[PDB]
């Protein structure tokens, strides 16, 4: 229930915009009801040398994590209801990416019903296809695709 | 000359931290004084199905152009006396970019006298290189890349 500055909204819009990523994710896993499971993460990645820039984002935000990955680190918001909360209050200032955040919120909302439906969750994972095609990723797995990101979960 | 709104300044400005590039770059040149010629350019590069978002800023910032590459399209701002007017209102927004822009201000500002000094204009030169530093470019050439440079020319 944070409520966020709105002139820096509109710059971390812009930023989102420029370089920041909404991501979605349905991965195999044996642990839940439908042998799937949801990740939603909001990224926004510098070279190491601006990570204070990421850490500075935690220090605003009030939530999220910065991970090193050698000379690129990211900060991360993957937390459901932290997440909503955010992309709720950037979205009106989105113009290229307000249609990914729109399908997060959107996604968001549904969990308790997709955690009980099948029909729920395949909707979800429409969902999740319509972020990956916004985002210009593949939305299709070849055999081999699938099998694999069985065999790496 | 012309005032550019608040909001669309520090949405612009994110935008530009993110994923714009200021740049400036001397190029060998014959006809010039002192045998090189300054380039400065503001950029912004987006895939060609997202034009629409650089001619938009055409629009918008009122001057400017859009290039097509291949799979991506270019909005450039390299006009000085727009370029000085577009950076100085957009200058207290940057947070990683900022410096970058404050450079090509004061090259902008030295141009006159850099017309007719060597000193002024290499001056000039050790700010290009300063911009490039900033922007993890290399600020140095080899005898074969300062050769070919000349070739290109």
Redesign the interface.
């Known amino acids: 229930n944070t409520k966020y500055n709105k002139?820096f909204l509109?710059?971390?819009?812009?930023?989102?915009?420029?370089?920041?990523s909404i991501i979605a994710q349905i991965k195999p896993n044996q642990s839940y009801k439908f042998k799937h499971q949801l990740s939603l993460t909001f990224q926004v990645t510098?070279?190491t040398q601006?990570r204070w820039?990421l850490d500075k984002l935690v220090d605003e935000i009030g939530v999220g994590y910065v991970r090193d990955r050698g000379s690129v680190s990211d900060y991360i918001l993957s937390e459901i209801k932290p997440l909503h909360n955010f992309l709720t209050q950037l979205q009106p200032?989105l113009?290229?990416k307000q249609k990914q955040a729109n399908l997060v919120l959107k996604i968001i909302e549904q969990l308790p019903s997709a955690k009980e439906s099948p029909d729920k969750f395949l909707e979800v994972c429409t969902w999740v296809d319509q972020i990956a095609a916004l985002n210009?990723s593949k939305t299709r797995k070849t055999t081999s695709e699938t099998v694999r990101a069985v065999l790496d979960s």
């Open positions: 002139e509109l710059y971390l819009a812009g930023f989102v915009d420029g370089d920041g510098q070279k601006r820039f200032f113009k290229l210009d």
